[PDB]
């Protein structure tokens, strides 16, 4: 029993109670989100998506606080050509604990 | 002839892995006097295989 779904431009497979990290959603720091576009559900017998997304599939989960991941150095260097620029980047994310998964 | 690059401190060590010193584990006790000695060597007090030799 599990489900897969689109979220941050990427897909995730998951169970309820389980927490996953996604690209920043503009949702309240605590409220409950619905993911109306799940593309698979599971058991001993499971629903692949005829078209994309199983018929009446939808997942629930509460946003469990937002964040910024760890910092990454962007180094650029053109040996012998007198050029280099370095630039930092962090990248926002929001976490969800997945309550739903209604097939 | 001379190196072209500086040798690592690491290689230096390996070169010396054979430079270690060996203990003795080859010393005995005169049967007459208590004396410890090098095997086949006269004792400090001047003995050897029991038997004081070397008056002095």
């Amino acid at each position: 029993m599990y489900a897969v779904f689109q979220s941050g431009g990427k897909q995730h497979r998951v169970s309820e109670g389980q927490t996953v990290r996604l690209e920043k959603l503009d949702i309240a720091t605590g409220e409950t989100v619905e993911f109306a576009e799940v593309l698979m559900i599971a058991n001993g017998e499971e629903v692949k998506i005829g078209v994309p997304f199983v018929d009446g599939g939808v997942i629930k989960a509460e946003v469990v606080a937002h964040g910024r991941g760890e910092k990454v150095k962007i180094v650029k260097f053109r040996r012998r050509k007198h050029y280099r620029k370095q630039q930092g980047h962090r990248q926002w994310f929001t976490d969800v604990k997945i309550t739903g998964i209604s097939a | 002839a001379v190196q072209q690059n500086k040798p690592t401190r690491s290689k230096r060590g390996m070169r010396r892995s054979h430079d270690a010193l060996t203990a003795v584990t080859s010393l005995s006790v005169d049967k007459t006097s208590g004396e410890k000695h090098l095997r086949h060597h006269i004792t400090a007090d001047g003995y050897y295989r029991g038997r004081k030799v070397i008056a002095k």
Binding site: R13, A42, K48, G50, K73, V75 | -
Partner: protein
């Protein structure tokens, strides 16, 4: 107004050296060498980030194939099938069910073998 210069000198050197922890020989001990070793790591980094997505995709694929192969089908067709299967978009990494939930993977070889037929 002579300017000390050498406490901020220390500053930078220590900073670069810092990032050199782990690098062998004077790569972590000596600034000149540290500093280069550091700069390239940032390059190798930039590069490998995009390479990362490459490497993984081509992992998922080979194994997806391994799985479909087990189920009597080549990755190609499979994916085509899945494609033709009333659209049906769903990741290659997500087809990791290949690894764990095998009976499920098998259930896709069907949904694909079908619409594909």
């Amino acid at each position: 107004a002579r300017v000390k210069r050498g406490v901020i000198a220390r500053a930078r050197h220590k900073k670069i050296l810092k990032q050199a922890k782990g690098y062998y020989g004077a790569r972590s001990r000596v600034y000149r060498v540290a500093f280069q070793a550091v700069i390239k790591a940032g390059q190798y980094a930039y590069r490998d980030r995009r390479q990362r997505k490459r490497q993984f995709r081509q992992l998922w694929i080979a194994r997806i194939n391994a799985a479909a192969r087990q189920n009597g089908i080549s990755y190609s067709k499979f994916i085509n099938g899945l494609k033709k299967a009333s659209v049906e978009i769903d990741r290659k990494i997500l087809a990791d069910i290949a690894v764990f939930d095998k009976v499920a993977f098998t259930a896709l070889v069907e949904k694909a073998k079908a619409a594909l037929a």
